[PDB]
Design a binder for this molecule. Sequence first.
Ligand SMILES: Nc1ncnc2c1ncn2[C@@H]1O[C@@H]2COP(=O)(O)O[C@H]3[C@@H](O)[C@H](n4cnc5c(N)ncnc54)O[C@@H]3COP(=O)(O)O[C@H]2[C@H]1O
Lengths: 163, 162
Amino acid sequence: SGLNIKENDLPGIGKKFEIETRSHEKMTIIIHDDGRREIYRFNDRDPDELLSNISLDDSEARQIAAILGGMVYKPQALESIEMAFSDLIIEWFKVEKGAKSIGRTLGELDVRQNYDVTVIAIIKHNQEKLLNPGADSIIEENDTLVLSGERKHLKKLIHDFLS
Amino acid sequence: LNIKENDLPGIGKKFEIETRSHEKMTIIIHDDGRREIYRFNDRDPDELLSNISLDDSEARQIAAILGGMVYKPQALESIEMAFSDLIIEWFKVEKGAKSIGRTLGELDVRQNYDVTVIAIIKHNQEKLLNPGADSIIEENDTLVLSGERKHLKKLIHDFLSG
Ligand SMILES: Nc1ncnc2c1ncn2[C@@H]1O[C@@H]2COP(=O)(O)O[C@H]3[C@@H](O)[C@H](n4cnc5c(N)ncnc54)O[C@@H]3COP(=O)(O)O[C@H]2[C@H]1O
C-alpha cells in the first residue's frame, strides 16, 4: 500500500516515526516524552544526508498540525465523498442471521435497479477480498458488504434483505 | 511561534511560519488538498533547505502525529486500505471520449471491465449519488471509478480518454 510509516519506541526517549510518502520522500518524526517534536528531512536518494532538522514543543507542533491538517484552512475542492457528495453514505454491513438475501446473487436481486444501492466490495466469511462484485456474485451469511447510497435507500435495503 | 497567513486566489492559502529559534517554513495548501512544505534558512530566505509534497491523506496523517490527534480515514480511504488492490479513482472524460453520449448501461462497464462507478459529478455540478444503467455520460463528467489497477487502465483507454 501507499504512505509507509514505521513506528519504533525508543526506550526512555519516546516514539520514532520513519515516514516515506507516495512521492518517495523520506522524513523522520520524533516524539519525546516531554512532548517535544523533532522533524528530520533526508535526501530522496540518500538517507544519510540530512537536509533539515527542526525542534518544536507540544503547543508549537499542534499549531502546525492544525494548519497541515486542514483545520485552520479546509481545502475547498477535495475529492472525497464527504466534501463533494453531501448526501452520499457508505456503510459496511454484515448479512445477519434471518436475512432474505442469503443465497441469491446481485443479478438475481437488481439492488442498484430496485434500491439505488451500489455494492463496491465484499468481505466474505473466509476473508476473501472481493474487488468489484458482479451480477454473478453469491451472497452468503456473515459476508460484509461495502454499500453506497442514500440514508433512506440504505435503510430500505437493510430493512428488507440485509437484516 | 509567529504565523503569517496570506490568500492565494485560485490556489488556496499559504502559511509562513517562523519559530523562536528563527527556523522558518512555509506551508502551501491547495484547495484540492495538495500540501507543499518548504524549509528555509534561519537568516537567508533565498536558501531552500528541504521540501516535501503531500496530498490530503498524507498531510492529515502527518498532522495527526505532530499534534496529539488521532487520524480518522475518510470513507473512500478506508476502502482502499482494506481492499489491497482495489483502486478508487476520480476521472473526468476527455475531448472526444467514446463514452460521451452513451449511458452506463449501453457501455456495460461492470461486466466488460469489472469496474463499478460509485458516483458522478455531472458537468453542471449536479450530484449523481447512485449512477444506474440509465445514467448518461457527457463531456466534463467526473466519474468515481472502483476497480483493479489493470481494469481501470483499459476503461479509460477505451472510452474515457480521447
Ligand atoms: N453505476 C454503474 N457501475 C458499473 N457498471 C454499470 C453502472 N451502471 C450500469 N453499468 C453497466 O450496465 C449494466 C446495467 O446494470 P443495471 O444497473 O441495470 O443492473 C445491475 C444490478 O441491478 C445488478 N448488480 C450486479 N452487480 C451489482 C453491484 N455490485 N451493485 C449493484 N447492483 C448490481 O445486476 C445488474 C448488473 O449488470 P452488469 O454488471 O452485468 O452490467 C451493468 C454494468 O456493466
